[PDB]
Swiss-Prot record, chain D:
Stretches assigned to the BMV domain: 1-84
Domains (record comment): The tight homopentamer forms a pore with an opening of about 5 Angstroms in diameter which opens into a wider tunnel at the base of the truncated pyramid. The pore is positively charged.
Record Pfam families: EutN_CcmL
Keyword vocabulary terms for this entry: Bacterial microcompartment, Carbon dioxide fixation, Carboxysome, Photosynthesis
Name listed for the protein in its UniProt record: Carboxysome shell vertex protein CcmL
General function of this protein: Probably forms vertices in the carboxysome, a polyhedral inclusion where RuBisCO (ribulose bisphosphate carboxylase, rbcL-rbcS) is sequestered. Has been modeled to induce curvature upon insertion into an otherwise flat hexagonal molecular layer of CcmK subunits.
Family in the record: Belongs to the CcmL/EutN family. CcmL subfamily.
Localization annotation: Carboxysome
GO cellular component: carboxysome
Organism: Nostoc sp. (strain PCC 7120 / SAG 25.82 / UTEX 2576)
Description of how the protein assembles with itself and partners: Homopentamer. Interacts with full-length CcmM.
Domain of life per record: Bacteria
Entry-linked PANTHER family: BACTERIAL MICROCOMPARTMENT SHELL VERTEX PROTEIN EUTN, ETHANOLAMINE UTILIZATION PROTEIN EUTN
Amino acid sequence: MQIAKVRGTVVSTQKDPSLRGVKLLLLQLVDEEGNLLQKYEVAADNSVGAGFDEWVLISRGSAARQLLGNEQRPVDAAVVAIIDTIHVEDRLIYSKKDQ
Amino acid sequence: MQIAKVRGTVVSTQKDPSLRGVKLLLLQLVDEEGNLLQKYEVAADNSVGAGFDEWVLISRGSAARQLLGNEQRPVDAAVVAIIDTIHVEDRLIYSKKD
Amino acid sequence: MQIAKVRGTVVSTQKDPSLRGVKLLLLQLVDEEGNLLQKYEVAADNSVGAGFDEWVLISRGSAARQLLGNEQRPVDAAVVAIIDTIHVEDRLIYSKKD
Amino acid sequence: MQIAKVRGTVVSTQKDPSLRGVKLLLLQLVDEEGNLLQKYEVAADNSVGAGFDEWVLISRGSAARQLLGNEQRPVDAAVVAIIDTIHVEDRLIYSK
Amino acid sequence: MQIAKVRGTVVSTQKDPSLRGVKLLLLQLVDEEGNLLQKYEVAADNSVGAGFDEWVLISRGSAARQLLGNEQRPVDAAVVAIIDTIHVEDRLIYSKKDQ
């Protein structure tokens, strides 16, 4: 899974019927050291419910279809978790309460 | 999924019979601001009706086969949606209207 | 799917029994603007039978296994189409005729 | 599969229910000499139980769901092994 | 599929049971001309048994699970062929025979 930051939402009304109801989020990718990149993607978030500027984990490929309801939906990226902390050794790469 | 723009159309006559009557569009990926990137998919667009230079969403890999009728087709990219708006922190960065 | 150019054949005598009879082509990938890349893929072509220097559409991943006979073969790339023409808005970048 | 080093822990309290109790590790890929690269995966690690600095093998995509228990989990990276050695034959590029 | 060269063997004693008895090779990816890249990966080979310096074809993703007995194993890369030659127009750029 990749780490990304929730930046916003993508609204579509003309779309495949299997995507009806599916919330789509615009995410900004994070690199290994915790820097934001100028790379973005759109992921479904029908199961986790992440809010603005939270860090989340994205699962890509058929993994995204294991979330309930997604099995026969055409999603190749899904929000699977909201990150609270990323420990490195015993020092915090990331912490939600701070940022 | 990736935001893209319809930039072209590929015509083939000699092809797998599963692709008879499936329009083949060249979809070039865009950055967050709609600038074209050096990445593309030739992607199936059967059920949404993407036209010239609108923003669309593409799904890739086995997700492409989840669209109606694509189940047994050798497609690895599909247009799944036409974008109406994109907001970032509730500020509008894209609206199809304009 | 990606656009690519057939740039030769790969011959194997020692391979998994599943790949027996599967013709494998060395394909050079093509970018969005029609330029060849220094970047080569090996793809099954048991179905469309594409010739030397022809441009083709490649499907990757399990998509490649949807073609006749490929269902239980370890193929992750397959020729799905021979390209006659490619356009951009309304500009020829590739024509099999020309 | 890719060789990687365990570089961190990722902790989540809000997540898809199929991820409850799944250990999430930050894994940074390495080249053939063990130099860390600028690519990573957050990977599930319930099977193997790798510890910090250890070299591990990661399988990606639907392979990650083949570990017992991961079958219907939305995971696209998993630790499948801890590397002891890598023979470049009589020449040894790793030994743990 | 990718062209690679067998550069070594990966040995592991602590691993998922689904991987016991599975031979793992370290493979160096190659581009066109035959030039090794400084880009390596680890693939299963319990069905071809390629040796050192052999050029092989690698299948990735779920294709790798189509080999006999890889079906419920976490393998995303497998050796599927030993490449005899690579014929180009009327040239021919590789051949076991010579190397």
